[PDB]
Write a protein that binds this ligand. Structure first.
Ligand SMILES: CCCCCCCCCCCCCCCCCC(=O)OC[C@H](CO[C@@H]1O[C@H](CO)[C@H](O)[C@H](O)[C@H]1O)OC(=O)CCCCCCCCCCCCCCCCC
Ligand SMILES: CC(C)CCC[C@@H](C)[C@H]1CC[C@H]2[C@@H]3CC=C4C[C@@H](OC(=O)CCC(=O)O)CC[C@]4(C)[C@H]3CC[C@]12C
Lengths: 10, 390, 406
C-alpha cells in the first residue's frame, strides 16, 4: 500500500 | 523575358512593327503571381446582382435578336446577311460561354454553388463542352503557364528539334504529317484551331485518366454535352434539313470557336515571350506577367463578350469577379505599368500570326516563318548528310 | 508610382517572413495558455478517473453477467507500467526510475502511430542491449547479471559495470536512445538523446543525469541547435524561456554554467546544474519533464524540408542540417566522462565498436525505415461508432413506435 517510489512532490 | 532591357526606342519600333501597344520591362525571378493581389482595394471583390444579370442577359438578347431576324426570313436570305446573323449569334454565345467559364472556376456566384454549377453545365452544353474537364484543363494551364513540354492545354508552340525529328521520321516533308502541320499552321484555318482542342477534351472518353473518387462526377459531366447532341441536334435537322442545320447551328459554332481561338492565341503568343522548360530558367510570376498580352476591344464588344479579353486581372487574383475585371486592370497599370504588354484588334497582327510567327526556335528564342525554317532545316539536313557521305 | 525590380523582392521577403512568424506563433499558442499542464497531465488524468468502455460487445457482456469494462488514459497507463520490464531495475535509483519511466511513457503516448523498434541487426544481435563487464563475450546467454556474484574489493573485475540500452525509430526521428549504466562503487548514470531525421530542421534533444551514492552530482538538459549560427527557431527559444520562468523560478541562475565543451553545442538557454537539495532537484525534474514533452508535441506538426530541383536554398539548408547533426555527434563522444567509464572496464577495442556503431553513430546515407500504423485509428473508432446491418433498423423503428405508445 506504500509508494516506495520518488516524486518531485515529496 | 526575351527582348528584355535595352533602350525603349527599339522596343517601341518593335511594338509598331508587330502592332503591339507596348513591350514589357524587366522582371526578376522569385515571385508569386498571387503577390500583386494585395494591391487591389477590398471592394473589387464585391458581389452585386445587376451586373451579373446584365452579363448573362445581354448576349442572350443578342443571340435572340439574331435568331428572330433569321427565322423571320429563314432561308430566303442572301449569303452576307446569313454571315451577319451567324457572327451576331456566335458573339452572343461567346459572351454566355465566358459566363460559363466564370461559374466553372466558382467565382461567378459563390453564394449558390449548386445553382452556379448547374448554370455552367447548361451553358456549356450547346457548345459540346464538359464542365469538369474544362476546369481541370484550365487549372492545369494556370499551373504550367508558358512552360515547355508541360502546358499542352494552351497554345503549345511547335519547336525546332522536334520538327527535325519528324522530318527524319517521315523520310522527307512529303508525308501526311508534315503536310497537315503546314496547312494547319499557315492558312487562316489556324484561327479555328480551337476546334482541335475540342477534340482533345473527352480524353479518349476514358475514366482511367482521373481520380476514382470523382468518377460519378466526370461521367455526369460528359452527359450534358452528349444528351444535347443526342436530343436537340436531331430535332433541328428533323425540322430544318441539312441546310437548315448549316445555318442555325454550325455557323454560330464556327464563330464561337474563332473567338475562343483568337482570344487565347493573341493572349499568350508573341515574339518577345520565350518558352523555357523549367529547370532551364522558368518562373511563375515571370512567365505569368512578363510572358502575357492583353488585347483591346470596342466597348460594345466588351459589354457583349463580357470582358472576355482581360485574362491577367484574374491571373493575379483567381477569385476576382467578372464585372470588376476592367477596373482591376485600371489599378494594375498604376503599379506594373512598365512590365505589362498590350495590343489591339488589327488584321495586321493576325496576318503576322499567320505568316510570320509560325515556328518557335529556342536558339533565338523567338518565332520565325515556316517556309524559311523548313528550307533552313532542309539545309541542316544537307549539312548532316555532308558530314555523313564519309 | 510604379515599382522597381528591387522592392518586389522586398515584397516577397515581407510576405514570407510574415508567414514564418505566423506559423512560429501558432506553434507556441497551445503551450502559452497553460504551461503547468506540461508536467501536471498525469495528476489530471488520475483525477478524472476510470472511463467506462461502451462498445456493443462490452454492453452485451455487461448486461448478460455483470462485468463492467474500464479503460484509462495513456498517462495513467504508463504510470502503472513504470520502469516496466527493464532487466536492470531493482538496482536503479528512484530518481533515475522516475525519469526513465516518464521519458519512455512520453514516447509511447505521443509517437504511438510510427514508433518502430530500431533494426535488430544493428544493436540487439551483437548483444548490446544488456552489457556486463564480468562477461564481455556473452557465454552466459545474457543472464550474467544473475549468475555471477559481485566481485569483492581488490578482486579481478572490481569495479563491475553494467549497461542497458533501448533504441527506437520513428517518422520524424531517426533514433530515440535511452541508456542506463551502473557501476559497483555507487555511480549511476542516465543518458537520453533524440535525433531528428536529416530531412527535418529541428534541434536535437539531450539529457544526462549522473549521481553518486544517491546524490545527483551533475544534471544537464539541452535542446541543442543544428544550424551553424547556434540559434534556435522562435518557438524553441520561446518555449524554453517560458518553461524556465514557470518551473525554475526561485532558483540560482548563476548555476547554469557553460562547460568547456558546452558552448559549442549549447543553445543559449541550455541548462547545466549541480543540484544542492531537494528543491533544486524537484524543480529541475519537473522542468526537464515539461521540456521533453513540449519538444515532442512540437515535432508532432513538423513538415520535411524538401529540395526541389531548381532550388539551391533547400539544398544548402539540408547540407547545414547534415553539418549540425554530425558536429553534435562527434562533439558528444568527447564527453569523455562516460566514455572513460566505459573504457576503464570494457577496454578500448570493444568500446570503439560499440560507440561508433550505437552511441553517437552518424551515417547520412543510412536512416532506418519506420512502420506507419495509423489505419488502426480507424478500427478503434468504428468500435465506439458502429453501424448495424439494415435489419436492426426495422426492429428499432418497431421498438420506438411500440414504447412510445404510452
Ligand atoms: C468565349 C469566352 C472565352 C472565355 C474563356 C477564354 C478561355 C481561353 C482559354 C481557352 C483555351 C483554348 C485553347 C485553344 C487551343 O489550345 O487550341 C490550340 C490547339 C493547338 O494547341 C497545341 O497544339 C499542339 C499541336 O497539335 C498540341 O496538340 C498541343 O497539345 C496543343 O495544346 O489547337 C489544335 O489542337 C489544332 C490542331 C488540330 C488541327 C486543326 C484541325 C482543324 C479542323 C478544321 C477546322 C474546320 C475548318 C475550319
Ligand atoms: C456528330 C455530331 C454532330 C454530334 C456530336 C458528336 C461528338 C459527341 C463526337 C464526334 C467526334 C467524337 C470524338 C472523336 C474521336 C475521339 C477519340 C476516341 O478515342 C480514341 O481514339 C482513344 C485514343 C487512341 O485511340 O489513341 C473516342 C473519343 C473521341 C474524343 C470522340 C468523342 C465524341 C465525339 C466528340
Amino acid at each position: 500500500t506504500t509508494g516506495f517510489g520518488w516524486d518531485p512532490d515529496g | 523575358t526575351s527582348l528584355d532591357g535595352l533602350p525603349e526606342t527599339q522596343k517601341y519600333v518593335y511594338a509598331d512593327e508587330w502592332g503591339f501597344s507596348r513591350v514589357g520591362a524587366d522582371f526578376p525571378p522569385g515571385s508569386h503571381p498571387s503577390l500583386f493581389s494585395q494591391l487591389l482595394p477590398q471592394a473589387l471583390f464585391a458581389f452585386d446582382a445587376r451586373a451579373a444579370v446584365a452579363a448573362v442577359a445581354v448576349p442572350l438578347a443578342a443571340m435572340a435578336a439574331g435568331y428572330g431576324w433569321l427565322w423571320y426570313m429563314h432561308s430566303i436570305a442572301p449569303v452576307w446577311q446569313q454571315a451577319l446573323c451567324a457572327a451576331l449569334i456566335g458573339t452572343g454565345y461567346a459572351g454566355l460561354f465566358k459566363v460559363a467559364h466564370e461559374c466553372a472556376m466558382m467565382r461567378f456566384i459563390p453564394q449558390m454553388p449548386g445553382l452556379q454549377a448547374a448554370l455552367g453545365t447548361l451553358l456549356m452544353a450547346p457548345a459540346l463542352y464538359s464542365l469538369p474537364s474544362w476546369r481541370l484543363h484550365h487549372l492545369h494551364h494556370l499551373l504550367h503557364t508558358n512552360m515547355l513540354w508541360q502546358d499542352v492545354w494552351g497554345w503549345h508552340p511547335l519547336t525546332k528539334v522536334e520538327l527535325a525529328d519528324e522530318m527524319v521520321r517521315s523520310g522527307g516533308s512529303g508525308g501526311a504529317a508534315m503536310a497537315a502541320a503546314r496547312l494547319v499552321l499557315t492558312t487562316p484555318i489556324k484561327l479555328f484551331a480551337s476546334v482541335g482542342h475540342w477534340l482533345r477534351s473527352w480524353d479518349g472518353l476514358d475514366l482511367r485518366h482521373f481520380h476514382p473518387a470523382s468518377y460519378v462526377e466526370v461521367l455526369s459531366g460528359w452527359a450534358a454535352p452528349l444528351a444535347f447532341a443526342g436530343l436537340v441536334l436531331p430535332a433541328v435537322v428533323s425540322a430544318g434539313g441539312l441546310s437548315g442545320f448549316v445555318s442555325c447551328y454550325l455557323a454560330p459554332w464556327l464563330v464561337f470557336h474563332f473567338w475562343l481561338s483568337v482570344l487565347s492565341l493573341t493572349a499568350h503568343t508573341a515574339p518577345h515571350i520565350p518558352w523555357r522548360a523549367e529547370g532551364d530558367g522558368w518562373d511563375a510570376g515571370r512567365a505569368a506577367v512578363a510572358g502575357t498580352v492583353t488585347l483591346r476591344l470596342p466597348r460594345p464588344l466588351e459589354v457583349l463578350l463580357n470582358n472576355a479579353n482581360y485574362m491577367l486581372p484574374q491571373a493575379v487574383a483567381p477569385g476576382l469577379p467578372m464585372w470588376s475585371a476592367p477596373a482591376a486592370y485600371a489599378v494594375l497599370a498604376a503599379r506594373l505599368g512598365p512590365y505589362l504588354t498590350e495590343a489591339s484588334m488589327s488584321l495586321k497582327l493576325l496576318t503576322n500570326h499567320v505568316t510570320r510567327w509560325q515556328i518557335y526556335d529556342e536558339e533565338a528564342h523567338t518565332y520565325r516563318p515556316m517556309e524559311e525554317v523548313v528550307d533552313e532545316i532542309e539545309a541542316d539536313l544537307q549539312q548532316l548528310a555532308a558530314a555523313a557521305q564519309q | 508610382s510604379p515599382l522597381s525590380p528591387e522592392d518586389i523582392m522586398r515584397l516577397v521577403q515581407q510576405h514570407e517572413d510574415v508567414a514564418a512568424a505566423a506559423e512560429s506563433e501558432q506553434l507556441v499558442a497551445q503551450f502559452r495558455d497553460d504551461p503547468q499542464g506540461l508536467y501536471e497531465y498525469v495528476n489530471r488524468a488520475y483525477a478524472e478517473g476510470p472511463r467506462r468502455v461502451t462498445t456493443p460487445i462490452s454492453l452485451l457482456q455487461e448486461e448478460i453477467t455483470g462485468a463492467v469494462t474500464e479503460s484509462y488514459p495513456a498517462a495513467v497507463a504508463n504510470d502503472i507500467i513504470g520502469m516496466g520490464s527493464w532487466r536492470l531495475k531493482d538496482d536503479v535509483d528512484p530518481v533515475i526510475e522516475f525519469l526513465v519511466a516518464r521519458l519512455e511513457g512520453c514516447w509511447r503516448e505521443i509517437l504511438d502511430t510510427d514508433l518502430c523498434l530500431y533494426p535488430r541487426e544493428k544493436w540487439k544481435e551483437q548483444g548490446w542491449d544488456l552489457v556486463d563487464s564480468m562477461d564481455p563475450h556473452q557465454e552466459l546467454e545474457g543472464f550474467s547479471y544473475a549468475d555471477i556474484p559481485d566481485p569483492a574489493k581488490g578482486e579481478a573485475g572490481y569495479p563491475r559495470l553494467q549497461l542497458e540500452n533501448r533504441v527506437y525509430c520513428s517518422k520524424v526521428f531517426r533514433k530515440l536512445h535511452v541508456e542506463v549504466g551502473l557501476r559497483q562503487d555507487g555511480l549511476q548514470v542516465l543518458h537520453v538523446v533524440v535525433y531528428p531525421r536529416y530531412s527535418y530542421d529541428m534541434p536535437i534533444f539531450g539529457m544526462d543525469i549522473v549521481m553518486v551514492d544517491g546524490r545527483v552530482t551533475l544534471a544537464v538538459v539541452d535542446c541543442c541547435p543544428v544550424r551553424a549560427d547556434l540559434k534556435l527557431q522562435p518557438h524553441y527559444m520561446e518555449t524554453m524561456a517560458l518553461l524556465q520562468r514557470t518551473f525554475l523560478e526561485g532558483t540560482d541562475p548563476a548555476l547554469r554554467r557553460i562547460p568547456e565543451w558546452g558552448s559549442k553545442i549549447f543553445s543559449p538557454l541550455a541548462l547545466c546544474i549541480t543540484p544542492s537539495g531537494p528543491e533544486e532537484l524537484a524543480a529541475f525534474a519537473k522542468y526537464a519533464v515539461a521540456l521533453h514533452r513540449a519538444y515532442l508535441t512540437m515535432s508532432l506538426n513538423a513538415v520535411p524540408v524538401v529540395a526541389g530541383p531548381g532550388d539551391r536554398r533547400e539544398a544548402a539548408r539540408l547540407q547545414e542540417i547534415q553539418d549540425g547533426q554530425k558536429r553534435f555527434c562527434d562533439n558528444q563522444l568527447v564527453n569523455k566522462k562516460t566514455r572513460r567509464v566505459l573504457e576503464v572496464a570494457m577496454g578500448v577495442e570493444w568500446t570503439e565498436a560499440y560507440m561508433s556503431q550505437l552511441m553517437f553513430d552518424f551515417d547520412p546515407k543510412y536512416e532506418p525505415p519506420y512502420f506507419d500504423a495509423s489505419f488502426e485509428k480507424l478500427y478503434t473508432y468504428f468500435d465506439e461508432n458502429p453501424s448495424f446491418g439494415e435489419m436492426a433498423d426495422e426492429a428499432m423503428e418497431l421498438e420506438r413506435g411500440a414504447e412510445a405508445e404510452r
